[PDB]
Structure formats: structure tokens, C-alpha cells
Structure 1
Amino acid sequence: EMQLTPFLILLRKTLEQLQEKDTGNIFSEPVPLSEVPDYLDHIKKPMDFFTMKQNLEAYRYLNFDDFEEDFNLIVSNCLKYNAKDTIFYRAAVRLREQGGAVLRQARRQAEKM
């Protein structure tokens, strides 16, 4: 199939590119549950870019689809929790659009391995 180290290098670069689309850094760290006490009533699996980085280095992403699944959780959790008329909801829509393009290019590079 493919070698581990170039794949992880690609995922590290891809995660950096996704974070660059989140210009407010609102997805950089976990949603603060102390300030959002009802969050887990709605959200089954919180996700954020710091957690994704930890998972990457813990060798928890060994195919592109598991990496993309967690990125999609960042977006979908935000759309689910927040009302449509909020900056947060719109930011997740924009991240879905801009990040989908980053992911398509990165997946093509993975398929070259």
C-alpha cells in the first residue's frame, strides 16, 4: 500500500492548511464545556484542530477518511449547536467550503503514494 512517514507528513501539512482557513481560530481548541454547559446534550463527539493534531501524532489517522471524518465533525458539530444567524454557524459553512477544496487536493496526493 503505502509508507507511514510520508502519509503523516502529508496529514500534518493538510491540517496546517485547514487551520489557515479558520482565521478566527475559533476551532483551534475544544469548545469550553464549562462555558457551554449544555453542549454535550446536543453533541456526541466534540472535535477541534488541537485534538486532531494530538490524534495525528498518536497514529490514530492511518487513512485519509478517518482524518476527513474528524474535520467534518468540527464543521457539523458547529452547524448543529449554533443558530443559523450566528457568526459561528456561518464560519462553519465557510470552513466546509474552503476546507473541502484543501481536502480534495490532499487526497489526490495520498492516492499517489
Structure 2
Amino acid sequence: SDLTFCEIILMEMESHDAAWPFLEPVNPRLVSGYRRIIKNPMDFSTMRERLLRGGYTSSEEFAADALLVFDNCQTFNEDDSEVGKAGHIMRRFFESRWEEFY
């Protein structure tokens, strides 16, 4: 039942308007300084790979990766950058949906 909501909310974040910065890993060959500043990158496809393969034990583990996406987003991107402003839309969305199941 737990991982059924994670399926719903990852589906909902994967198809969200604001999801475009987070759908695929950051390419550090293209984003100068990313490799150095972000110790543990995370993106929605890696969570999808991990969920489909079954690599989540609970909803907490799933939610940690989701929050690491947005924690990384705020570390690397200015709150008013385009990725930044998208990041806040996604984080608020995730925070909300998560709380209206738990």
C-alpha cells in the first residue's frame, strides 16, 4: 500500500509542468561546477529505475530521494533561476501530495 502511493506521486511528478529540470540526471559535462558542489545527485528517472527494480524498502526511503532532488536543487540553483523557480514548484507539490496521504 505504501509503495502504491509512491507510484502515484512519482507518476504525478514525472508528468508535472515544472518537472523538466529533474526528469534526467544532471550532465556534469554541461553544468559547470555541478560535480563539485552536489555530493549525491538524484533525479526522477533514478527513482523510477529504483522503484521499478523494487529497491525501496518503505515510503521514507522513497521520500528521502525526493527531498534530495529538491535539496540539491536549492544548493546548486539560485531561488530566482529558472531551474530554481521550477524547483520550488516541484518541492511544494511533492510536500503537499505527500501530506494528503500521510
One fold, TM greater than 0.5? yes
The CA deviation at 1:59 is 1.9
Which 4+ residue blocks in structure 1 deviate beyond 4 angstroms?
A: none
Structure showing greater Rg = 1
The CA deviation at 1:24 is 4.8
1:29-108 matched pairs, under 5 angstroms: 29-106=24-101, 108=102
Paired residue for 1:12?
A: 7
Equivalent AA in structure 1 for residue 45 of structure 2: F
Equivalent AA in structure 1 for residue 70 of structure 2: V
The CA deviation at 1:62 is 1.5
Equivalent AA in structure 2 for residue 72 of structure 1: L
Equivalent AA in structure 2 for residue 34 of structure 1: R
The CA deviation at 1:60 is 1.8
The CA deviation at 1:7 is 3.6
Return 5+ residue gaps in structure 2 as ranges.
none
Q: For the residues of structure 1 that align with 2:96 and 2:17, how far apart are their CA atoms?
A: 14
Equivalent AA in structure 1 for residue 25 of structure 2: P
Q: For the residues of structure 1 that align with 2:98 and 2:15, how far apart are their CA atoms?
A: 13
State the identity %.
27
Aligned length: 102
| Mean CA deviation greater in 43-52 or 91-100 | 91-100
Q: Could you tell me the TM-score, scaled by structure 2's length?
A: 0.86
Paired residue for 1:111?
A: none
Structure 2 vs 1, CA of residues 98 and 47 (structure 1 numbering), >3 Å: closer, same or farther? same
Structure 2 vs 1, CA of residues 37 and 87 (structure 1 numbering), >3 Å: closer, same or farther? closer
